Amino acid sequence: VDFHGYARSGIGWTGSGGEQQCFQTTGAQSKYRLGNECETYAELKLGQEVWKEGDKSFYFDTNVAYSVAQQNDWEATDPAFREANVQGKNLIEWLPGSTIWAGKRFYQRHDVHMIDFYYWDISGPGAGLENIDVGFGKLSLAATRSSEAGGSSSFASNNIYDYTNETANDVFDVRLAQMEINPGGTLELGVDYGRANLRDNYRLVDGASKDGWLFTAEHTQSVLKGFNKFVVQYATDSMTSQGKGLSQGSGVAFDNEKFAYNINNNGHMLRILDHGAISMGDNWDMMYVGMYQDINWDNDNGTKWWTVGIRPMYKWTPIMSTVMEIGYDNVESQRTGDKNNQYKITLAQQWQAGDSIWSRPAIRVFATYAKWDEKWGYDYTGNADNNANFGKAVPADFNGGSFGRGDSDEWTFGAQMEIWW
Amino acid sequence: VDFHGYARSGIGWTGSGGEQQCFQTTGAQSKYRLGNECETYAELKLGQEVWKEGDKSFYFDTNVAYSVAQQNDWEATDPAFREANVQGKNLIEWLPGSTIWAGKRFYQRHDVHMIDFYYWDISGPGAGLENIDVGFGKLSLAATRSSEAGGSSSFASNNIYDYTNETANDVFDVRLAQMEINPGGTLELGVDYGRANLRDNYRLVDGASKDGWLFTAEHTQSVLKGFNKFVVQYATDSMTSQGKGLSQGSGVAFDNEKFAYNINNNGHMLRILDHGAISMGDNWDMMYVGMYQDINWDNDNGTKWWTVGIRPMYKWTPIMSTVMEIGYDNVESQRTGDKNNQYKITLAQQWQAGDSIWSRPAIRVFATYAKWDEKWGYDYTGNADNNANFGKAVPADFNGGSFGRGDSDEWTFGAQMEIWW
Amino acid sequence: VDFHGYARSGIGWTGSGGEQQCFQTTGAQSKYRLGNECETYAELKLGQEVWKEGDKSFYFDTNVAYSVAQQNDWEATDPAFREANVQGKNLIEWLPGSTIWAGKRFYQRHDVHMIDFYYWDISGPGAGLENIDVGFGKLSLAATRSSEAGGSSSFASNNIYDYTNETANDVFDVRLAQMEINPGGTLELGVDYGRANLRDNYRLVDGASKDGWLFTAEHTQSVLKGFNKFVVQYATDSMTSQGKGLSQGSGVAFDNEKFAYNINNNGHMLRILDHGAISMGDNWDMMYVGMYQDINWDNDNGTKWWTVGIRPMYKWTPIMSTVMEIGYDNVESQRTGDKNNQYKITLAQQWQAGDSIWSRPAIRVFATYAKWDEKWGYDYTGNADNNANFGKAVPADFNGGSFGRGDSDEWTFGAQMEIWW
Incomplete structure (x- = not known):
């Protein structure tokens, strides 16, 4: 039986209070992960070569995924059966x-x-x-x-x-x-x-x-x-x-x-x-x-997105390093021309099973900081029947309500494991 | 750890349009499977002999089943814990x-x-x-x-x-x-x-x-x-x-x-x-x-059922064959004496890991055709309170509504894998 | 891949009728298990040492739990993803x-x-x-x-x-x-x-x-x-x-x-x-x-609890024994001073994979008897809004209703397996 997967799990805290929070720019399709992930996610694969005759072989492969909030021990969940295929070489x-x-x-x-x-x-x-x-x-x-x-x-x-x-x-x-x-x-x-x-x-x-x-x-x-x-x-x-x-x-x-x-x-x-x-x-x-x-x-409801970031790792030992990540996003609403943006800076001390930035298991201790200034958001107030702008990009103050994430700050910090086998 | 199971999974299309459909005669308790299965179904067993002393031994066995619609990647589901027993020989x-x-x-x-x-x-x-x-x-x-x-x-x-x-x-x-x-x-x-x-x-x-x-x-x-x-x-x-x-x-x-x-x-x-x-x-x-x-x-609400079919396989090579299946059903309502019937014909080209009709993994490419003529159905319109014939066999045109599957035709076709390990 | 777990599963009957029942004193936080467990419960662990270099190593560990009523074959359930961690020694x-x-x-x-x-x-x-x-x-x-x-x-x-x-x-x-x-x-x-x-x-x-x-x-x-x-x-x-x-x-x-x-x-x-x-x-x-x-x-809504019991096992053979368990509970309501109590006696004939009271797999055939006399209970009638005593300890006859389990008797009996690997 071949056993493989991916899993990430951990514990965290937010500067201002409570469990850890994560930062993603409204309008962007991604967040810079380091010290910015808030779930226990896991894929357990169990596959096996079921027949080989010379060059000819048949491999069987499966994958069951689990995602939970990691705020408690017993956390029930509907798992997703994502792969169950056969490849014949x-x-x-x-x-x-x-x-x-x-x-x-x-x-x-x-x-x-x-x-x-x-x-x-x-x-x-x-x-x-x-x-x-x-x-x-x-x-x-x-x-x-x-x-x-x-x-x-x-x-x-x-x-x-x-x-x-x-x-x-x-x-x-x-x-x-x-x-x-x-x-x-x-x-x-x-x-x-x-x-x-x-x-x-x-x-x-x-x-x-x-x-x-x-x-x-x-x-x-x-x-x-x-x-x-x-x-x-x-x-x-x-x-x-x-x-x-x-x-x-x-x-x-x-x-x-x-x-x-x-x-x-x-x-x-x-x-x-x-x-x-x-x-x-x-x-x-x-x-x-x-x-x-x-x-x-x-x-007219599209978006124009820009990202850049870097993750430079410096290795004190073949198993101890200090990893740091800096990222920036900027999204402009096609409908309104307004711009949302943010930048993140995380500092972590890790212990991996390798001398590589690509090698896992990894165990981290980190601190993250983020400052954003969002000027537009999606109108999700109401009902698709009540509202006629349901789902449209609208400015931050549209009709006196607040849309967007605001112009603020925050820092979190904690410990996490990550690993693919 | 012993790993065993069963799994079937695939992709298909219907002649007239959309994702593939499957054909089963109203009143019968089964369908002829070849190129007539519409789900990804799977049982993952993990068992193990935990103690042996001579002839004496204790085996532990478990089985978790998953059934999904295979119309998407991420498909969450409540799995069924079907076996968890101990046998002592x-x-x-x-x-x-x-x-x-x-x-x-x-x-x-x-x-x-x-x-x-x-x-x-x-x-x-x-x-x-x-x-x-x-x-x-x-x-x-x-x-x-x-x-x-x-x-x-x-x-x-x-x-x-x-x-x-x-x-x-x-x-x-x-x-x-x-x-x-x-x-x-x-x-x-x-x-x-x-x-x-x-x-x-x-x-x-x-x-x-x-x-x-x-x-x-x-x-x-x-x-x-x-x-x-x-x-x-x-x-x-x-x-x-x-x-x-x-x-x-x-x-x-x-x-x-x-x-x-x-x-x-x-x-x-x-x-x-x-x-x-x-x-x-x-x-x-x-x-x-x-x-x-x-x-x-x-x-008076029983049924009288008849089936026959055959699956003859001809082997071009010790791993390539052409399988074909032909099946027929005919069900008569005890309550009304009316008769529902159908027949299916499927043609497939497979690649197995064996020279047997009983050997899997198998990978198929197929086409299926079915013609039915159903003259009776079960009345499920309404509510068990609204309706007094709720669940009874009734003719196809009863009170002007349509019951049954009709008198029609169809063909589907696709690719599938099947395997027990 | 390392495979470990715990599982218990079985079948039972109640003297007076129907599927087996279990006895726990109102107010106590536990029941004496032998021949007094009513679920199929199971934890499947799959872990693995992913890297070793001398003394240094990284172990990956996971645990998925399942609990079902064991009154049917196909029993769907939301499983709980309880562990997914990495330890670095x-x-x-x-x-x-x-x-x-x-x-x-x-x-x-x-x-x-x-x-x-x-x-x-x-x-x-x-x-x-x-x-x-x-x-x-x-x-x-x-x-x-x-x-x-x-x-x-x-x-x-x-x-x-x-x-x-x-x-x-x-x-x-x-x-x-x-x-x-x-x-x-x-x-x-x-x-x-x-x-x-x-x-x-x-x-x-x-x-x-x-x-x-x-x-x-x-x-x-x-x-x-x-x-x-x-x-x-x-x-x-x-x-x-x-x-x-x-x-x-x-x-x-x-x-x-x-x-x-x-x-x-x-x-x-x-x-x-x-x-x-x-x-x-x-x-x-x-x-x-x-x-x-x-x-x-x-x-004033606390409790004062007392328990004692013993499980003496006598071994006929290195794999056949007769286990017996006797337990007693007594709980007093802080709010009312009333007392709930009960005692259980179970007799079982087991077959283990060991000469120990601590050794499993075990297969049992048993009979249990219990007599209780409860004089107080928790008021859960109503709604937390309808009721002002919602959740409070109240006497058995409070406002003519019945609270508590009563003053009664019962015996059950059946077969079960239990095992940690």
């Missing part, structure tokens, strides 16, 4: 070294550690033919699925509230990788096409985006005993809302009172990313990220 | 080779693969003395439990709605097996007696069945490098509703609005079964089933 | 043999088997430095967390119902152990300080206890090839309600209708305990417990 003579798989599986996820941001992830139930050797590089094919809460209707109606049927979306993915465009550099290219797949006779709202495209290109260059990736992505319509490769072609959302509202996503998004990890000598290691993301929608 | 000198066990355990289940039908299953919490050698065969004894949602009352009342207390049922099982009635053939005989066990002073409805019998006889004959089982079962009253060995002696049910209705089951059932798997040479394998089941109840 | 040169850990962890629990009573348990999320060698003994330090459902308010109000905010409590623990005060004897001393940690600006009710102390001293003396522990504990205010080391400094509770009531706990508690297990020769083993616990609160 070399079973097809004519296309050697390639795998065929089917099942619920996390498929080639591309992410950015310090921000816990995943920029290319189409995982879900699915199937595919992986690593076909095309000579200059390796070609892979896959189809995965997702499905939005409602968004379809049993009959034509002008009433949005009639569109409460779960509406399924399909994604077709093609990638070409490990192409050595230069010395030390590699190039991957991928194309994603997603569409809402409707039941016989159901209909979507008028103006519903229905489908879309995602185009990815990533260059991986080896450097300073580390690496540096530079990405460029472009998405259209149904691919813009999630922006990782999954489609939401229905345009319909829901208030907590189950009333439907309209989150139409026709428009486009452009992402420019560069992140990496380099070692500069024997006593220093450092991770870094820089990004610019622009979601411009037809309905 | 040879601990009793005077009755050698026998085991004593206690705990929640799946106990000697008899089922029919292609239809996923279990015809003899009394699993649940329980205890027993297993495999006592009686010379001509092996004798086993057990007591297991079940409990219906409500059906008991704290005081005598004429009001059904007063009978909302969980009512427990007990089962006492005795089997005698591995009797060689002929060359290559074996005979098992079993008797099940179930009864509702009431709390001091509680009462059941008038006319409540209260108890019942299940009688089983199964002959296993070795043939064509395979086998063929022929079963005959007979049940009375409380054993007729579930019809696998568990008792439901209260006769009370519940609408989604929690109103109680009366599903009295006095009557009887007779089942005739023959299924098996045979290899005809080196390039062909085939599974087959034939059944006739008649539930005749005192209230 | 010898990572700090200057304080050898000591461990630093962080994460959700069960930390040094002290309990009494036959009554399933835990008398010193501060487990929960947390962190600490363990086993520092102080020469005469070993010194350990830790901080763990808990959090009450509500009890805090966003603004000052006189209305209790305004205090519905989850209010977090912190605990700071210090222990000094393995001090050989005598030949064969050891002494542990510990101090716990708990307090409610409020969010900036929140307030607690007036009179709220807010904090408290727990003082523990335990002497472990080796005897009759077994041991005997003698404990003395003293707690004040917020430490009195749970009385194991966790703080509940808010004083607010909640009716099932979510109305808040006031369970103020200013006061103190004193506990005197002595329990142990001794072998007297080769054919006898016996566990025993004696306790006196007095919770005296400012609001």
Whole structure:
């Protein structure tokens, strides 16, 4: 039985009082993690090679995830059964070294550690033919699925509230990788096409985006005993809302009172990313990220995002270090032109099982400080029926209420463990 | 740590549109599985021999099941803790080779693969003395439990709605097996007696069945490098509703609005079964089933069921085959004499880890087609209070509404994995 | 992968009718377990040493618990993710043999088997430095967390119902152990300080206890090839309600209708305990417990508790025994001076994997008998709004209703498995 996973768990306090709090800029899609995570999260994998005959083999893999608030011992929770798939390597003579798989599986996820941001992830139930050797590089094919809460209707109606049927979306993915465009550099290219797949006779709202495209290109260059990736992505319509490769072609959302509202996503998004990890000598290691993301929608409710931060680690011993992280966000509302921003600074003393910034288990003792000044927010007051601006970007003082997080300060501090096995 | 289980997971599409659908005849208790399963289902077992001293040993066993819709990545679910038992072999000198066990355990289940039908299953919490050698065969004894949602009352009342207390049922099982009635053939005989066990002073409805019998006889004959089982079962009253060995002696049910209705089951059932798997040479394998089941109840709401189907596999290679399944159902309403029926045809190309129709992991690519013509259905419109025919078999056009599945067609197709380890 | 746990599961019946019942004296905090447990409970641990370099190592540990009613096969449940921590041994040169850990962890629990009573348990999320060698003994330090459902308010109000905010409590623990005060004897001393940690600006009710102390001293003396522990504990205010080391400094509770009531706990508690297990020769083993616990609160609603019982085992064979348990409780209401009491006698024939009263797996067949005479109870009739005595100790016949369990009898009997691996 193979046992693997990820887990993070801990204890913390807030300067001003009570249990620890975490800071994320309103409008951004990520927070700088170090000493800024507030949950016990864990994935327990148990897989096993069930048959091998020479080169031919069949691997079985599973993954059950748990997320709890870590404010008590006995914490009950509905766990999520995220993967249960089978991969068969070399079973097809004519296309050697390639795998065929089917099942619920996390498929080639591309992410950015310090921000816990995943920029290319189409995982879900699915199937595919992986690593076909095309000579200059390796070609892979896959189809995965997702499905939005409602968004379809049993009959034509002008009433949005009639569109409460779960509406399924399909994604077709093609990638070409490990192409050595230069010395030390590699190039991957991928194309994603997603569409809402409707039941016989159901209909979507008028103006519903229905489908879309995602185009990815990533260059991986080896450097300073580390690496540096530079990405460029472009998405259209149904691919813009999630922006990782999954489609939401229905345009319909829901208030907590189950009333439907309209989150139409026709428009486009452009992402420019560069992140990496380099070692500069024997006593220093450092991770870094820089990004610019622009979601411009037809309905003027997009955003323009900027981030940068660095995590330099200095090693006193092969198992004791002092890690520090500094990050900055700035988000501008497409609808109002106002700007939200913040910056975080964390200082931690860790003990890892490795001489790397990439090595875990790690045990930390830390202190974090953050100052923000947010001038806009999302209007979620009311009901999607009571409110006509439900879900729209509005200024901080709109109609005398307060929107946004304010212009304030805070510091927290505590102890935590983190680990992938 | 011993790791075992079962899991099935995949992706699919329906000809006419949307995610894949599955076909089961209204009134039948099973569907022909190949390319006709719509869930990710999985059982993860982790057991371990905890003590051995010679012949004497103690085994610990557990089983946690998960069922999800496989239409998304993160799918939370309440898992079911189905087994947690301890079996002690040879601990009793005077009755050698026998085991004593206690705990929640799946106990000697008899089922029919292609239809996923279990015809003899009394699993649940329980205890027993297993495999006592009686010379001509092996004798086993057990007591297991079940409990219906409500059906008991704290005081005598004429009001059904007063009978909302969980009512427990007990089962006492005795089997005698591995009797060689002929060359290559074996005979098992079993008797099940179930009864509702009431709390001091509680009462059941008038006319409540209260108890019942299940009688089983199964002959296993070795043939064509395979086998063929022929079963005959007979049940009375409380054993007729579930019809696998568990008792439901209260006769009370519940609408989604929690109103109680009366599903009295006095009557009887007779089942005739023959299924098996045979290899005809080196390039062909085939599974087959034939059944006739008649539930005749005192209230005229029974059914008369017929099924037949075959799954012949032809092997191109020791790991590539083409499997095909053809099945047919026909159910007649006891109350109305009308008949529902359907037939399915599936064609699949698989890759297994074996040269057997019985060997998994398996990875499939398939297409299924089904045509049905149902003339009767169950009336579930309304409320058990609003409706007086709530839950009764009624014709397709009864009071102008539509009951049944209709007279239609459809085809689906996709990819799936399946595996027991 | 290391696999460990605990599990208990089984089947039972009640003399007078229905599924088995269990007996616990109203007002006591425990029941004598043998043949008196009514659930399938289980903890599955999967941990693993992930890195070792000489003396230095990092261990990863997890624990998922399941509790079900064992009255049916398929029993769905929300499981509780109770531990997920990392312990690093010898990572700090200057304080050898000591461990630093962080994460959700069960930390040094002290309990009494036959009554399933835990008398010193501060487990929960947390962190600490363990086993520092102080020469005469070993010194350990830790901080763990808990959090009450509500009890805090966003603004000052006189209305209790305004205090519905989850209010977090912190605990700071210090222990000094393995001090050989005598030949064969050891002494542990510990101090716990708990307090409610409020969010900036929140307030607690007036009179709220807010904090408290727990003082523990335990002497472990080796005897009759077994041991005997003698404990003395003293707690004040917020430490009195749970009385194991966790703080509940808010004083607010909640009716099932979510109305808040006031369970103020200013006061103190004193506990005197002595329990142990001794072998007297080769054919006898016996566990025993004696306790006196007095919770005296400012609001007159405390209790004065007394227990004693013994579990003597006689061994016919190295794997067959006859175990018997006899227990007695007597609880007196501080508010009314009335007394509740009961006594239990169980007789069982077991088969263990060991010649010890402490050895499992065990498989039992038993019969239990209990007679009680309760003269007081807690008033839970009504609503915390409807009722002004909601939650108070009141006599058995108060206002003509019946409170308490009565003056009665009963016997049950069945089969069960129990095991820690």
